Amino acid sequence: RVAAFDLDGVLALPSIGPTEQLMKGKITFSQWQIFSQAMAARSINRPMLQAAIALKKKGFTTCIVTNNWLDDGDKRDSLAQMMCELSQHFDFLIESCQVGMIKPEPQIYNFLLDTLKAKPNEVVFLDDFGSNLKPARDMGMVTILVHNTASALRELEKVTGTQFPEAPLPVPCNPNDVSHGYVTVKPGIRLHFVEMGSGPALCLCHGFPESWFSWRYQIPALAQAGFRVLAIDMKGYGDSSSPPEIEEYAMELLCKEMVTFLDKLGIPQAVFIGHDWAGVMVWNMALFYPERVRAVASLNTPFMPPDPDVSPMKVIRSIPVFNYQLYFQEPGVAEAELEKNMSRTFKSFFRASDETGFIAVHKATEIGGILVNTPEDPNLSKITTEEEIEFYIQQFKKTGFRGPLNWYRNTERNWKWSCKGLGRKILVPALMVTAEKDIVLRPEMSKNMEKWIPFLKRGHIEDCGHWTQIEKPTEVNQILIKWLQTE
Amino acid sequence: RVAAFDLDGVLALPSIAGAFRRSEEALALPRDFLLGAYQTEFPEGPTEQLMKGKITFSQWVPLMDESYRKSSKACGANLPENFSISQIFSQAMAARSINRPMLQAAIALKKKGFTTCIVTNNWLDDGDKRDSLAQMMCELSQHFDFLIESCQVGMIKPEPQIYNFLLDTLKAKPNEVVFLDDFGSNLKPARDMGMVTILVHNTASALRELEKVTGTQFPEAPLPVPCNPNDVSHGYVTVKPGIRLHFVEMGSGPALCLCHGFPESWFSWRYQIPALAQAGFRVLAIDMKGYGDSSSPPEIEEYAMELLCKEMVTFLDKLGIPQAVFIGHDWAGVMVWNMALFYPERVRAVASLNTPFMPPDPDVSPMKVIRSIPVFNYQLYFQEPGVAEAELEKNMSRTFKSFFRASDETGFIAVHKATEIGGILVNTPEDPNLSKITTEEEIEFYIQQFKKTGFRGPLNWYRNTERNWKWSCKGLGRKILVPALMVTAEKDIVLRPEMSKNMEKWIPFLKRGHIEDCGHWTQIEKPTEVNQILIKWLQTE
């Protein structure tokens, strides 16, 4: 079925002849004040926008039929953003000032069903007036008024269809419904990414074994937060070049290229928010290229400078919760296990802080592999949808697993490199977000990070596993936004 | 054969060193007091952990500050107790910009086939204003093959080991390589090794003079920074099922999309894109529907201006951009004005090249107005599908060198005769001469581009006359009340300037720009100006 929504005050609040032609479109705004400001005060009616994606996801045809008008005002920008935001969550836009006719003139209505290809019955309209809803039900449409700021609305709306949650999730941007940039930094290597919103720029780098798609919940919000996001596919993963050479992944290089990728893209500075392995790079970016980093934020991953008199490898042979990691060392091995069956491999890796079928991070060598435990047919974690997983699959089907793993296999070199930035410190805006129930990459591993990063601001989330962006998304967003906001 | 230059005093001016100087005298400081912390074969203390990249900048202040305070009252003149060097080294670094002529001198050899690069005594600026450096550094980025940052390779000038590290990568001998510095004390090693020394003193000329003497000659008014070849980002937005729009990106916001005309491609703005970016903008040289790497359907309806504008809008939403500056030329320009006319909200501002805002006559068949204007015959010729195509496709080489010619050049197109002699390239030479406005390669791109898209799609732009008319007739009671720019070309045969004159009846406040001796290919004929005009425009709004 389909869902129709007015705008005057059904998807934006506060709510709100000759200029009856202003509606029709023969006249613009700057055509005729003490009223302008009012259109700028109103914002999106989130729970309603929710109620929409709801159906949209549920297999309906959403849409907006409003009594528009052309805004050439001094503050139309607003409308744009709102418009450009609602854009993605509807199939058709029946703007009054676009099709000549305006509510409640019956010709507009006939125009909708017409484009909608539907019968008045299997279509429900939503208006805060009712004088505009008379036609709808008259036609055989399921009418629904507003009067208030929703609730009662979304309520008698639930009835027709399904139910909506009180505390929802941030809209998961996706899939192809996005732009796909492609920068070629070195001959054989090109880095694919994603883009959204207008500057300043902040690149979101993922970890192991993930993809840009991971930030699927941060990207939109972050954009709408007034930013130009660049969910990049880290070298080796997804649509970016994934060479077979190990040297190709030395952190020293990854950071260098990361920089190139900027020049190429003509961006002179960006905010670098990293997680997992990325997070490592992010901190090194901050450490080696201050100029190009506007600011840095890290999830789970803490800044752990290297010990100059302590073989980096030894520090791994030590920490017990880094076995699997060791297991990865040998090329072909680790790969062979994860590739053998990507389905499991993933539903396996991706599990909540409070969930079964965990990975074998420490018994790895001994039991023969990071997955030697765990069921065969893992259960879908209440953190990824089959589809959500399938993307990761398709992604990896084309890239393989060697490339990503080669991130681990550059220990000595990495050590030898990060040793140069031992006499200096991170003096650019920084953020360290710690996860609580994160088995490996435990919070307490930061504690002395300030010895290196004074002024370092922090953020911490409870009941959060390693998959922060996907486990506690809404919070991650908040924390992140509010962070950028205050700097 | 390569050529390198110590950025501060060669690529960047006024040499930061100058600031120290003018600061010494300021506080009656004996010649070279705080100067040592920069110009001294005494690379020691903190200033040596700085260029060495061991410690950042911010640290180098509290440390250097006190290391200065060393000889403060001890062995030397009075150096204010609380006296620091933070915000004084900071300004000097910011107040400095790129040495345009010298950069020129570089791209020269680069073009000429040399291995440019920069060997500077760097330091990692984690300053409150380190951005500046990023930009200037992000710019010089593309013009050099190698960047030898002192603060990145451990060694700093003039310690021999650095130099021996450069040739190592440049895989060259001391003889076939030239070094540019503003000190000379830094140049001493170079000569001794076997390199071509040159005191980058003075400011320019004199340097480029003694330079010229060993390379070639440099333009007096060089050709603006061109953004090509494949050294760019390539976005790809899918607006409707089968249709996806490819484009190009550069710099940081706000956004302004550059739409091309017929028969061109994003590559046309190759001269505006960079400059525009460097002008503080995020450019989107888009490949108009039908052209190059964007979907180029076979349907005619697919190109109704009404649609092109709609999709143009979608392309924005999709890209998450809520507003942009729309600068159009030719057919694009038309759309651009309609964009302004139909979607005010999404247009921050509009600029048009050659193409004027010509609303439609409500009581005058749009077609008739074409059958009338004599300089629109070829256009008419295009009407019939397959025909026009067949002519332009038969041999893209000519087709292009043909279309693309200067205001003052031969082999013109047959804009009015067409229909009669059947064709536009009909009476044009067999093998046209390369116009002093496009390089063979420049043309080849257009070829490859069109080889994959064909010619139907682009032409379908012409074939939507009635519909277009019927549509633009809706925006007859309103006007363009958003910032606008109308740039007129002088020697533009078709799309003559005088066709604007009453544009203000529709667009008050409409600002204008006009260029002389300019044909239809404005962006390629008078690029530098187009840039200026455009920039200065955006600048003042």
Ligand SMILES: CCCCCCCCCCNC(=O)NC1CCCCC1
């Ligand atoms: C002394 C040098 C120390 C360098 C430390 C670099 C940081 C290592 C981060 C490793 N991260 C991961 O291995 N993540 C995987 C663990 C298994 C489940 C998915 C996520």
Ligand SMILES: CCCCCCCCCCNC(=O)NC1CCCCC1
């Ligand atoms: C619906 C009314 C349309 C009115 C058309 C106004 C002017 C459109 C611009 C046309 N531009 C061109 O035809 N340019 C070509 C002309 C032949 C040589 C290359 C450039």
